[PDB]
Design a protein around this ligand. Structure first.
Ligand code: NI
Lengths: 282, 268, 277
């Protein structure tokens, strides 16, 4: 008989998970390059784009990437996002690169087996399940809406890959309380990377409104916010946003986040139609 | 190929696991519970609902209910709640004939929202009523924290193995067979009544509790009990489970032939 | 349907995992693994250290007094023997089984009774006799504690992957190495390692003072193309070969082309290996 094994996922995925080194020039008195911080990263495609954690590369004078096949590259920082703790790196590779398996049509499910891959002790693999799937939208809601897993997530595998039993990327491990780890869902991680590549930063739309649906009841209105300037008031009920029926608070704030700053959109509330000018997130 | 997944167990079991809010009016304590049946009975931990002025239950489908306290048991750290069942309730899958085995895959289901973790059964534990302590509870390496305490332990079919209860790596759960028995006794009597013979240690008697049933019947230390209540005593642990099932006030012979009357287990 | 279960592995393996009692009162507790019908048992050195009397308890209730055959500091392994004429449960062992990263494993150990936890192989480790440190043991996310230390790490067939030895990363001696160590402890009462005194054709980085290499005339920066009539491709593999060579043996070492006769010696006794230094 065949022993039960996730080795298939490992062989398919693991070569695309790299070591990431943060080196400073002010770290020691002799101003020689020295490692400040270590972490993991995931090679996304053959152009040399790599996703890692922002906290791994913060204030780096030099970023080094090391592949499992022995190759070492200096990396350039494309951009970073504090809200997701993600950063994107670019290495210049000759001769091809290993790349993480991805299936964009795969729907992650609570209970899916996952392996956490991270690269002192060498490349480590730990196993768990998806505890919670989290949200793929741009509106930051906090950590509760990231992907949760009971696969051990430590400083060793942070910025590394979370894959399913087929070796397909589920998310990017991010260190952040009791026996539970977090990852950025891959669908969101991909969106963040494309935005960082294009704009050098993640641009979010911000309407400055709190609320919860029973339409959507407004609990609070941010001061000097787009909603306040438009004339929106507390206790008001928003039945539509940008010609999109609003059945949900979380769903609506995700829609706003996609809307580019400077865009004017109708906000229907009960019936007064207000013209709101979307602004960049804080 | 499809990804390896326990999502089947999740889909079946998870809707039956609820949040429990202890209010003393603000929320003092939080926990999880398991809807047992369509009558609206819910099992949770005693330590969750202790000193509650009001108890509230929230289902994954968003419905919120005020809950009645039916009763609780310190020894198993279980409590039973009851809520309005009118509209119909999601219930935990249960198989009374299912025999749990060491090595069985289990999911612990129960702040950050509903949380599901995976592990195996390390030890099956005893389903009897005589309190033995936590060592005889079901043990699992599926992470057990405050978040899931009072929540469900289920197998890959979604069937209920146990009720989660609080080294560092091992979690404990009341075996579902014992939880079922506790719940029924709480529904009937409003508390768990246990038969108590007051004997430690055929079966060699190590000690005899003072002013206990055994002492009053004439049983002396170092005596050998070959039978209790027309049953052979092969095992101490199994004999005490039998005693626990016996109603207080009942007179049974103890062959060592002495007549003893059962006393209700000490409340503390 | 049927519930997903590793119980098969449990029924095959767990009976062979025993409680080990170090008494001097009981100074220390631990777990052990019955390896074969002869009654040899593997456990941890740190469990049986300074033991006046060692006792072994099987899950079936039988209890035995154990003889200490020997121990090895580098692998934290020790071997016990018990005399049992009533037959013994043995751990399943498959010597042709190749452990892979990602294999499911159960950690079995024998307070709170026998405990079983589940995880995977994070890293396979090395089976060589030359000590490399903890980095090269087998790594697993199956919880490894005082409870199961010295106990068995098995795959889903109940076959032995390794022997548990003490964050969320557990270590075990790979079974292939554990078997080699046990056989050496049984024969010699201690692990005797061949030592050439060289740092890692193969470019020599350093030559230990008063060492076998130094006495043979080998110099630093030299290239070793052969050792004991075997090609030297790799440093790690070559030091494993030397480790198997009995002390006192005289082997040729070809270097570029001078042939040198080296007298292998015992590995200088080092309790300092795992110390940082
Ligand atoms: Ni030292």
């Amino acid at each position: 008989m065949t022993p039960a094994s996730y080795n298939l996922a490992v062989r398919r995925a693991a070569p695309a998970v790299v070591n990431v080194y943060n080196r400073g020039l002010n770290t020691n008195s002799h101003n020689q390059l020295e490692i400040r911080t270590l972490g993991s990263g995931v090679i996304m495609d053959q152009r040399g784009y790599i996703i890692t954690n922002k906290h791994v590369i913060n204030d780096a004078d030099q970023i080094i990437v090391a592949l499992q096949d022995g190759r070492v590259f200096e990396a350039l920082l494309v951009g970073s996002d504090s809200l997701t703790d993600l950063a994107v790196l670019k290495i210049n590779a000759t001769g091809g690169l290993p790349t993480i398996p991805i299936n964009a049509r795969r729907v992650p499910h609570i209970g899916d087996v996952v392996l956490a891959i991270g690269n002192n002790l060498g490349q480590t693999i730990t196993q768990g399940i998806i505890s919670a799937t989290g949200r793929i939208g741009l509106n930051p809601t906090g950590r509760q809406n990231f992907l949760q897993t009971d696969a051990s997530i430590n400083h060793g595998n942070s910025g590394g890959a979370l894959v399913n039993s087929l070796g397909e990327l589920m998310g990017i491990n991010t260190l952040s309380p009791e026996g539970i780890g977090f990852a950025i869902p891959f669908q969101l991680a991909t969106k963040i990377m494309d935005k960082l590549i294009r704009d050098g930063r993640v641009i979010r739309g911000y309407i400055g409104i709190g609320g919860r649906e029973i339409g959507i009841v407004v609990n609070e209105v941010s001061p000097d916010g787009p909603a306040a300037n438009a004339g929106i008031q507390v206790n008001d009920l928003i039945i539509s946003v940008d010609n999109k029926p609003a059945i949900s608070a979380l769903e609506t704030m995700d829609q706003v986040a996609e809307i580019r700053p400077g865009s004017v959109i109708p906000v229907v509330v009960m019936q007064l139609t207000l013209q709101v000018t979307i602004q960049e997130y804080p």
